[PDB]
Structure 1
Amino acid sequence: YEHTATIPNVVGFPYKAHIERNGFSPMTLQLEVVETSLEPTLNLEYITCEYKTVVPSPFIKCCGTSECSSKEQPDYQCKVYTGVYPFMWGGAYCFCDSENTQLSEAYVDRSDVCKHDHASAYKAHTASLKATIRISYGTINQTTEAFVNGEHAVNVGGSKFIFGPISTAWSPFDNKIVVYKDDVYNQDFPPYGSGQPGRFGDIQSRTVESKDLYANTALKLSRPSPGVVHVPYTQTPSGFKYWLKEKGSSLNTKAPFGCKIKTNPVRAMDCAVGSIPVSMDIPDSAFTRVVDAPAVTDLSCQVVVCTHSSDFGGVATLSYKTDKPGDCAVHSHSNVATLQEATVKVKTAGKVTVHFSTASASPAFKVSVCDAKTTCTAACEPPKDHIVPYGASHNNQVFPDMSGTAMTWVQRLASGLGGLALIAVVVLVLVTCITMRR
């Protein structure tokens, strides 16, 4: 039997889907989203980590000149200084007074722990939803994982469920993402080959194992102090080590919709965004024939108490005539109030209680118990507790029913002034007849 529904993406909000199949007693399915995992596709742009500056011993040539050569090494710097005369602890290193040269050489390399402490820059696009859904109906109750696209049919109890494409393709990850251990950062990192000194990505590698490193640290060699061997130089401090203290708090504390952000793989859990289409193919064996169900009749409803609090703050008592005891499906046909319970034992004791949650001062909603239907109606007071550690189980419909006190007063005033206006119309029409007959 083909049926379709649309459940909120709110995790832990149990939706109730009511099937009124003509040949069978109704059934209420409960559909609860237990978990969601919105996972972006990642392209790795490059790896960033602290640089290692490699500075050999100076190739000091006493009593002679030195050439030097260019090399492919990252940020490589080399200069030959003439006229050096260094002293070591025991005396002058060179015999010649000025015919000496210090070949200074330095270059940048990837740090030896970059295998272990690095940040990876990603482009994050075309996210996909996977959801952990709990299906319960009758004697069948199961939790399953479904890809939230209109093709992955999952079986529960022999029912195919298809969780169709999510109502919106939103995701908390911007197009450019930086990932570091447990944290994810929305960050417009500089394109590969154009990172700048002293900022994130001043050295960049296409992979942690890559042979080729871009480096742009603005390393410069300077001349050694006279009589001192030290290969002096100046270089902009590691832009990665600046980043690590400049990061601030990560996307895990800033994502909208209460998303919880996790790495390995990068994903956003429990985003309360949009709604999920559902398609059911319930088999005939899941329904109970109308002969087997109780013929619930003369159904009526009293609301024993109602607070329009975020929990199930209202209580109804339903009263019945029945031929037999049995399980009946129960539903509320108006979204003004959602019911805690999906099915109830109908009893020869003739009454049952059903809990509901509602957000309006005076709801009215058609409940049902098997075939029987009745309009519950209430006067609901506001709660006294200003703040609660749990989300609303109602749909936050707050407009009161037309039979409520506020709408009663409104309808009295509006029908009063409307009747007076219609009477004035009747007067004017009667007069403007008389003045043309006479």
Structure 2
Amino acid sequence: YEHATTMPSQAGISYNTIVNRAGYAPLPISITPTKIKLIPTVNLEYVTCHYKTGMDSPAIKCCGSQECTPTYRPDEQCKVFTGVYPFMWGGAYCFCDTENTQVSKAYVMKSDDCLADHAEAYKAHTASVQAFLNITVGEHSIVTTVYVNGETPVNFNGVKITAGPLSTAWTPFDRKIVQYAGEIYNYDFPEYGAGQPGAFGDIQSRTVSSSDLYANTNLVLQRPKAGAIHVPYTQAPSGFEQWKKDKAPSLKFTAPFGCEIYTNPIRAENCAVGSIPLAFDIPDALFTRVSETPTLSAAECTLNECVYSSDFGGIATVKYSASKSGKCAVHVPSGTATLKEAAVELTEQGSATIHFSTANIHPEFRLQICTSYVTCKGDCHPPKDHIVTHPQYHAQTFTAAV
């Protein structure tokens, strides 16, 4: 039997329903998503880190000419400064006053700490939603991880569960993101091969172990001081450091819909966004006839207490006269009231207690119970505290009138 019902995509809050037919007893169904995960399809564009400016030892020729011998290292600068007269701890290096030459060259390379202190620049394409759910059908219970795509089923005990596509496809990650120190940032980093100096991406590598290294650090050499041996260089300050100094708070403190953000895998969890269109294919063999189950006759309902509140502040007693003692389900076919409990136990004729949370100030709802239903009605009072530390349990509704 094919049944389908939208389930609000809230983490920690439960959801209940009853599936029934003209000659088959109510079969309860309960769902509880303990963690809804939003993994995006992601690939690595590069990794960046602090640079370090390596530099070959100056090659000094005493009154002889030199040449800018080229090598091919990242962001290389090579220059042949003439008219030098260097000094060491032992005195003047050369005897010719003029015509001495010093060839000096400098280059960029990855910091020694880049293997463990680096930022990963990624592109995030599309979303994949998977949720850890607790599903019960007529006391057949399962705890699983369902891939929310409408395709992948979870088929334990013969009932086939399919969690349709997340109704409002949405991600907190833009197309192009960055990971650093276990925090995910939305940042339009330069494409590989366009990194500009003094900003994020000044040095880049396709992988942490990649041989290639593009560097654009605005490296330019200056002539050394007379009587000193060294390689002067003025360079744009490390763009990665500047990004660290100047960056907005991570998505874990700015993401919409209250999403939590985690980094392995890159993902967002507990996004209170949209709803999951669950579809349940219940086998014909799991249904039970109305005759077998406890049948209720001549029930009455009364709200012995009502506190219009986020939690289950509403209490109602049902006086029952059952045909045979046992257990059976209880529900409200309406968004007015959401029940804490799924089923109750009955002993011939007596009373039972139902907990619920409500939106209506003047509540009235049909409590469906054990192959019957009773019209519960009453007046309800406001709650105590202005602010509470948990999310809503009761479906909001327009009617809150006198």
**The residue matched to 1:25 in structure 2 has which SS?**
strand
Q: Corresponding residue for 1:78?
A: 78
Measured in 2, the distance between the counterparts of 1:125 and 1:303 equals 52
Q: Corresponding residue for 1:225?
A: 225
Q: Corresponding residue for 1:362?
A: 362
Q: Corresponding residue for 2:6?
A: 6
**TM-superposition CA deviations, 1:387-422 (whole Å, max 9, x none):** 11111110122514xxx7x2xxxxxxxxxxxxxxxx
Does residue 1:46 correspond to 2:56, yes or no? no
Measured in 2, the distance between the counterparts of 1:204 and 1:36 equals 34
**CA displacement at 1:283 relative to structure 2:** 2.5
Q: Is the 8 A contact 1:167 1:276 kept in 2?
A: yes
Measured in 2, the distance between the counterparts of 1:349 and 1:372 equals 15
Q: Is the 8 A contact 2:364 2:376 kept in 1?
A: yes
Measured in 2, the distance between the counterparts of 1:375 and 1:238 equals 71
**TM-superposition CA deviations, 1:222-244 (whole Å, max 9, x none):** 00111111211111111112212
Measured in 2, the distance between the counterparts of 1:178 and 1:282 equals 44
Equivalent AA in structure 2 for residue 253 of structure 1: F
Does residue 1:238 correspond to 2:200, yes or no? no
Measured in 2, the distance between the counterparts of 1:342 and 1:262 equals 34
Structure with the larger helix share: 1
1:10-409 to structure 2, matched below 5 A, reads: 10-400=10-400, 406=402
Equivalent AA in structure 1 for residue 158 of structure 2: G
**CA displacement at 1:138 relative to structure 2:** 2.9
Measured in 2, the distance between the counterparts of 1:297 and 1:308 equals 30
Q: Is the 8 A contact 2:321 2:349 kept in 1?
A: no
The runs of at least 4 consecutive aligned structure 1 residues that moved more than 6 Å come to none
Measured in 1, the distance between the counterparts of 2:385 and 2:349 equals 36
Measured in 2, the distance between the counterparts of 1:127 and 1:70 equals 48
Q: Is the 8 A contact 1:50 1:241 kept in 2?
A: yes
**TM-superposition CA deviations, 1:200-258 (whole Å, max 9, x none):** 00111111122211111001100011111121111111111221222242111111111
**The residue matched to 1:243 in structure 2 has which SS?**
helix
Equivalent AA in structure 2 for residue 80 of structure 1: V
Q: Is the 8 A contact 2:294 2:325 kept in 1?
A: yes
**CA displacement at 1:316 relative to structure 2:** 0.6
Equivalent AA in structure 1 for residue 399 of structure 2: F
**TM-superposition CA deviations, 1:66-120 (whole Å, max 9, x none):** 1112332111001101110111122111011112001111111112222221111
**CA displacement at 1:140 relative to structure 2:** 2.0
Measured in 2, the distance between the counterparts of 1:220 and 1:23 equals 87
Q: Is the 8 A contact 1:361 1:398 kept in 2?
A: no
Equivalent AA in structure 1 for residue 376 of structure 2: C
Q: Is the 8 A contact 2:305 2:314 kept in 1?
A: yes
**CA displacement at 1:285 relative to structure 2:** 4.3
Equivalent AA in structure 2 for residue 384 of structure 1: K
Unpaired stretches in structure 1, ≥5 consecutive residues? 407-438
Measured in 2, the distance between the counterparts of 1:206 and 1:56 equals 26
Judging changes above 3 Å, is the alpha-carbon distance between structure 1 residues 139 and 28 closer, same or farther for their aligned structure 2 residues? Answer: closer
Equivalent AA in structure 2 for residue 85 of structure 1: Y
**CA displacement at 1:295 relative to structure 2:** 1.9
Which structure: larger Rg?
1
Measured in 2, the distance between the counterparts of 1:282 and 1:346 equals 26
**The residue matched to 1:218 in structure 2 has which SS?**
coil
Measured in 1, the distance between the counterparts of 2:239 and 2:346 equals 71
**The residue matched to 1:240 in structure 2 has which SS?**
helix
Measured in 2, the distance between the counterparts of 1:290 and 1:349 equals 19
**The residue matched to 1:366 in structure 2 has which SS?**
strand
Greater CA drift, 141-150 or 282-291: 282-291
**CA displacement at 1:346 relative to structure 2:** 1.8
Structure with the larger strand share: 2
Equivalent AA in structure 2 for residue 367 of structure 1: L
**CA displacement at 1:15 relative to structure 2:** 1.0
Q: Is the 8 A contact 1:135 1:156 kept in 2?
A: no
**The residue matched to 2:112 in structure 1 has which SS?**
coil
The two structures, once aligned, show a CA RMSD in angstroms of 1.3
Q: Is the 8 A contact 1:85 1:94 kept in 2?
A: yes
**CA displacement at 1:169 relative to structure 2:** 1.2
**The residue matched to 2:252 in structure 1 has which SS?**
helix
Measured in 2, the distance between the counterparts of 1:155 and 1:358 equals 34
Measured in 2, the distance between the counterparts of 1:264 and 1:321 equals 56
Measured in 2, the distance between the counterparts of 1:308 and 1:156 equals 39
Measured in 1, the distance between the counterparts of 2:14 and 2:377 equals 23
Equivalent AA in structure 1 for residue 298 of structure 2: D
Equivalent AA in structure 2 for residue 82 of structure 1: T
Could you state the TM-score of these two structures normalised by the residue count of structure 2? Answer: 0.97
**The residue matched to 1:242 in structure 2 has which SS?**
helix
Measured in 2, the distance between the counterparts of 1:369 and 1:108 equals 75
Measured in 1, the distance between the counterparts of 2:243 and 2:86 equals 39
Measured in 1, the distance between the counterparts of 2:17 and 2:323 equals 27
Aligned length: 402
Q: Is the 8 A contact 1:183 1:250 kept in 2?
A: yes
Measured in 1, the distance between the counterparts of 2:397 and 2:308 equals 11
**The residue matched to 2:243 in structure 1 has which SS?**
helix
**The residue matched to 1:386 in structure 2 has which SS?**
coil
Measured in 2, the distance between the counterparts of 1:255 and 1:53 equals 37
**CA displacement at 1:280 relative to structure 2:** 1.0
Percent of paired sites with the same residue: 54
